[PDB]
C-alpha cells in the first residue's frame, strides 16, 4: 500500500529526471542545421523484375549477403528463395503451419529461418549434403506467435514474439541462452547494429529498446509514437534507427542523444506504416505503407522524394540489398517487385 | 563461356520443376476451405469440432474439404495475429446463449471482427451452441433477460420465427432476441459483401457441418456471382 | 509518451452520484476513440461505455444503459462518466482505456488483462 506508493512516487520523480536531462543536450533540432546541405531532389526508380510464384499473401522477405538471393514467405505455407538477377527460383520449401509472420536469411547464406502462429523458429539448412532442404532445428520456447527473427551466426538466433519477449537461441543445443524482458505488448520487429553487439526492438507499447545482447539488460528505452510500432530498422552508421507505427508516421532516433530528432509525416497520409528500410548511405528512409505504396524520405530534411506504386494491397515487407544497389517490396497481392 | 551456359540451365531447369509444383499446390488450395474457429471459455465451440499456438481440424462434407484453425496458444490481445485471416472462407463464431453475463462481451467481440479493415470482406457463421441450458434457464424463471438488456422487455418474437414443435412460447422470444443482437449489428454496417448466417445449436446436434457446407455454399455463390457481375 | 490518468472519486451512498474525468496526454485524443472499462471485485475487466471521435456515436452497457453517460472535450483532451443512481453492483475499479489506432471503429484488446493504453484506473466505491 503505502511502499507501492512510495516507490510509484520515486518511478515518476526520476523519470521527472530523465526528461529534465533529456531536455538540456537540446541545442538545435536536425532541421535546422540541415538547412545549409543541397536537396536531395527527386528520386524515381521503376520496377526492375517481379517475382510471381506466392498463391497467398506474403509476409516477410529478406535479402541475402550478396545483394542477389532473397527469400519470402507466404501464408499459404510455402517460403521461397530467389535469384533476383535472373527471376529464376532457386528452392520452395513447405511448412508445417501456414500462418507463417517472419523469415531470416543466415548472413553467410547456409540457413534460413521462419516462424508465425506455431510459436515457434524452424530452421532450415539450406546447403544440405543430399542437396535437399530439411528442418533444421525447431526451437519451441516462446508462448505466442513469433514476430520476427534474424541471425547472428550459424549457430545464434534473436527472436521476438508475441509474449511480450525476445530471445536468444543456441541452435546447436536448441534452448534460449538469453531472454529478454521489459517489454508490455507483443513485440513486433527487431534489427541488429552493424556490428552486432546489441539491437532495439519495437513493441505494441509505442515504446522501443536498445538491447545488450552479452549483457541481456535494456540499456535504453525510447518512447516515441502514439500506437504500436510495426517497424524498426537501425541507421548504416549504428548510431540511430527509424521506427514505424500505426499513428502514420516515422520517427528517427539517436542512441547517442537518447532523443528523437525527425518526424516523418505528412497530412495526406493516415495509414499505418508496415516496413522501413535505410539507403546504404542512409539519406533515404524508404517505408511501407497501408494504402498499398511505399515512400522515399529525404532523411536528413523530412522532405519527401520519390513513390513507389505498382502493388495491388498492402505492402507487408521491405528491403534494401547490402551494397544498396536495389530495394525489393513485397505486398499482400503476392508479388514482389525490385526497384532501382 | 560453355560453364555459363550450362550453370543457367540447371537454373532454368530448376524453376520448371518448382513451377510443376506450385500448380499441383495451387489447385489443391483453392478447393479447400479455411475457417476461423473462434469464441471465449464457455462458448462450447470444442464441442462443435466433432472430427501449441494454433489448433487445425479436417472435415469432410460431400467430398469438399475443410480446415477449422482454433487459435489457442496466444494471449488475450489478438489485434496483430488476427489479420492472418483475411482470406478465409468464413469465421465461424461460437457464442453460449444461456450466458447473460458473458453475452454483451461476445456482442463486442462480434462487431470488431465485423467493422475490422482487414476483416471488413468475410461473412460469418454464427452458432448459439447451448439453446438446452438457455431453455431450462427460462423455464426456471428465476434470472431475467431484461436486467441485463433492458430492451428485451419491449421484444416480441418474429413473425418469420419456426419455433421447434413443442417448446415454450417464452423460449422462443428469448432465442429471438439473442439472435437479433448480433443481427443487427451485421446490418448495421455490411454494404453486402459480407452476411451472418445465424444457427440455433445445442451439444447433441449432429447436423453442424452440413449447416456449415450451405452457408459455404452461400458465400462461394455471391463471389461468382460477382465476379460475372451479375449482382 | 501515451499515459491516461483518471480523477473520479471514493465512497458514495446508494443512489448517489459521481463524476470520473480522465486527462490523456501523449496523442492526439481528436483522433481515438475512447472506452471506459472496470473490474469489479474478485472479477474480470468489462466494458462499460465508448465515445467516438467527434462524439456522434455513443454506447453503453446493458446493466449501465440509462444512468451513466460518456462525454470527451477534445479541446482540453479529457473524457468524462457521469454516473447516477448508483447501486451496489457498481463498486469497481474503473479505468480510461484508448483504442489502439486512430481512425478506427473497431477497437481490439480494450478488455484484456494487460493494456498498454489504458489507464491506472480510480477506485469507486458504494455502500451505506
Known amino acids: 500500500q503505502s511502499e507501492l506508493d512510495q516507490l510509484r512516487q520515486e518511478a515518476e520523480q526520476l523519470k521527472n529526471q530523465i526528461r529534465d536531462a533529456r531536455k538540456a543536450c537540446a541545442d538545435a533540432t536536425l532541421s535546422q542545421i540541415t538547412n545549409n546541405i543541397d536537396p536531395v531532389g527527386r528520386i524515381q526508380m521503376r520496377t526492375r523484375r517481379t517475382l510471381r510464384g506466392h498463391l497467398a499473401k506474403i509476409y516477410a522477405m529478406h535479402w541475402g549477403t550478396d545483394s542477389r538471393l532473397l527469400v519470402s514467405a507466404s501464408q499459404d505455407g510455402k517460403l521461397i528463395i530467389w535469384d533476383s538477377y535472373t527471376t529464376n527460383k532457386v528452392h520452395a520449401i513447405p511448412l508445417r503451419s501456414s500462418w507463417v509472420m517472419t523469415c531470416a536469411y543466415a548472413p553467410s547464406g547456409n540457413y534460413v529461418a521462419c516462424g508465425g502462429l506455431d510459436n515457434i523458429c524452424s530452421i532450415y539448412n539450406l546447403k544440405t549434403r543430399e542437396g535437399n532442404v530439411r528442418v533444421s532445428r525447431e526451437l519451441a520456447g516462446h508462448t505466442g506467435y513469433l514476430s520476427c527473427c534474424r541471425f547472428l551466426d550459424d549457430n545464434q538466433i534473436v527472436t521476438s514474439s508475441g509474449d511480450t519477449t525476445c530471445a536468444l537461441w543456441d541452435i546447436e543445443t536448441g534452448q534460449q541462452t538469453t531472454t529478454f524482458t521489459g517489454h508490455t505488448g507483443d513485440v513486433m520487429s527487431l534489427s541488429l547494429a552493424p556490428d552486432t553487439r546489441l539491437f532495439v526492438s519495437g513493441a505494441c507499447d509505442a515504446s522501443a529498446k536498445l538491447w545488450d545482447v552479452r549483457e541481456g539488460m535494456c540499456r535504453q528505452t525510447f518512447t516515441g509514437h502514439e500506437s504500436d510500432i510495426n517497424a524498426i530498422c537501425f541507421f548504416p552508421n549504428g548510431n540511430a534507427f527509424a521506427t514505424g507505427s500505426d499513428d502514420a508516421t516515422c520517427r528517427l532516433f539517436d542512441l547517442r542523444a537518447d532523443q528523437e530528432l525527425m518526424t516523418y509525416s505528412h497530412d495526406n497520409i493516415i495509414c499505418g506504416i508496415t516496413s522501413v528500410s535505410f539507403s546504404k548511405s542512409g539519406r533515404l528512409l524508404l517505408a511501407g505503407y497501408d494504402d498499398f505504396n511505399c515512400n522515399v524520405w529525404d532523411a536528413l530534411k523530412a522532405d519527401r522524394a520519390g513513390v513507389l506504386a505498382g502493388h495491388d494491397n498492402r505492402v507487408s515487407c521491405l528491403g534494401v540489398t547490402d551494397d544498396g544497389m536495389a530495394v525489393a517490396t513485397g505486398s499482400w497481392d503476392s508479388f514482389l517487385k525490385i526497384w532501382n | 563461356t560453355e560453364d555459363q551456359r550450362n550453370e543457367e540451365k540447371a537454373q532454368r531447369e530448376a524453376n520448371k520443376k518448382i513451377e510443376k509444383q506450385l500448380q499441383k499446390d495451387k489447385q489443391v488450395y483453392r478447393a479447400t476451405h479455411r475457417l476461423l474457429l473462434l469464441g471465449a471459455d464457455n462458448s462450447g465451440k470444442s464441442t462443435i469440432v466433432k472430427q501449441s499456438g494454433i489448433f487445425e481440424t479436417k472435415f469432410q462434407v460431400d467430398k469438399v474439404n475443410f480446415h477449422m484453425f482454433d487459435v489457442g496458444g496466444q494471449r488475450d490481445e489478438r489485434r496483430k495475429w488476427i489479420q492472418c485471416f483475411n482470406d478465409v472462407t468464413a469465421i465461424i463464431f461460437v457464442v453460449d446463449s444461456s450466458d447473460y453475463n458473458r453475452l454483451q462481451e461476445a456482442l463486442n467481440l462480434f462487431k470488431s471482427i465485423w467493422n475490422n479493415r482487414w476483416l471488413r470482406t468475410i461473412s460469418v457463421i454464427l452458432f448459439l451452441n447451448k439453446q438446452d441450458l438457455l431453455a431450462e434457464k427460462v423455464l426456471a424463471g428465476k434470472s431475467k433477460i431484461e436486467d441485463y438488456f433492458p430492451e428485451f422487455a419491449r421484444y416480441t418474437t418474429p413473425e418469420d420465427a419456426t419455433p421447434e414443435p413443442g417448446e415454450d412460447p417464452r423460449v422462443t422470444r428469448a432465442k429471438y432476441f439473442i439472435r437479433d443482437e448480433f443481427l443487427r449489428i451485421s446490418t448495421a454496417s455490411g454494404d453486402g459483401r459480407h452476411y451472418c448466417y445465424p444457427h440455433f445449436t445445442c451439444a447433441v446436434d449432429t447436423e453442424n457441418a452440413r449447416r456449415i457446407f450451405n452457408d459455404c455454399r452461400d458465400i462461394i455463390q455471391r463471389m461468382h456471382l460477382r465476379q460475372y457481375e451479375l449482382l | 509518451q501515451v499515459q491516461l490518468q483518471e480523477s473520479g472519486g471514493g465512497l458514495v451512498q446508494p443512489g448517489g452520484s459521481l463524476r470520473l474525468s480522465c486527462a490523456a496526454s501523449?496523442?492526439?485524443?481528436?483522433?481515438?476513440?475512447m472506452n471506459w472499462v472496470r473490474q469489479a471485485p474478485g472479477k474480470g475487466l468489462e466494458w462499460v461505455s465508448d465515445?467516438?471521435?467527434?462524439?456522434?456515436?455513443?454506447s453503453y452497457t446493458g446493466s449501465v444503459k440509462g444512468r451513466f453517460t460518456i462525454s470527451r472535450d477534445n479541446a482540453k483532451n479529457t473524457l468524462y462518466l457521469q454516473m447516477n443512481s448508483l447501486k451496489p453492483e457498481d463498486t469497481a475499479v474503473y479505468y480510461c482505456?484508448?483504442?489502439?489506432?486512430?481512425?478506427?471503429?473497431?477497437?481490439?484488446?480494450?478488455?484484456?488483462?494487460?493494456?498498454?493504453?489504458r489507464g491506472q484506473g480510480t477506485q469507486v466505491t458504494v455502500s451505506s
Open positions: 482505456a484508448r483504442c489502439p489506432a486512430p481512425f478506427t471503429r473497431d477497437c481490439f484488446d480494450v478488455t484484456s488483462t494487460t493494456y498498454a493504453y
Open positions: 465515445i467516438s471521435q467527434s462524439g456522434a456515436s455513443i
Open positions: 501523449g496523442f492526439t485524443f481528436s483522433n481515438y476513440k
